[PDB]
Amino acid sequence: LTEEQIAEFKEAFSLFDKDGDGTITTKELGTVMRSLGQNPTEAELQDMINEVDADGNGTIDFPEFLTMMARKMKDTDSEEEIREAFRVFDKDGNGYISAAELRHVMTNLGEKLTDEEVDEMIREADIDGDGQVNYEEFVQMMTA
């Protein structure tokens, strides 16, 4: 356990915990989801909370959030997990991640990337130099 790790988890939690009251509500989740282009129903949002809500009180607190992370660090490799991740980027769903989409997704998730950083991130994964990242290239970067 390091200080830099805690800080990272703290800011991830803060992104969702809008009013900083120490809990993430279905309403707060909805806000972040909508800004990312997604449009879940109330039932879907509550479902998202319930799977991480260990004490079943209706909201997610820091310990539950941290536990979720620990469990996610165990397995990020399925297909459905990778596909799920790729789908977040591919906003329009045409099969490729463009620099514009990467920048938009990262900004709304609180990560400030420089134009140059965006391009380099894309370039490292762009196996066919077409300037985008398709599922295959995405999977190859994840599965290794």
Binding site: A85, L109, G110, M142
Partner: peptide, 24 residues
């Protein structure tokens, strides 16, 4: 729809400024 942990996974990648599992 994506899971909450998938969102944190993506944020971490952005944080590392690189694609690929940002943890392991």
């Amino acid at each position: 729809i994506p899971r909450l942990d998938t969102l944190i996974l993506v944020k971490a990648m952005g944080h590392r400024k690189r694609f690929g599992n940002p943890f392991r």
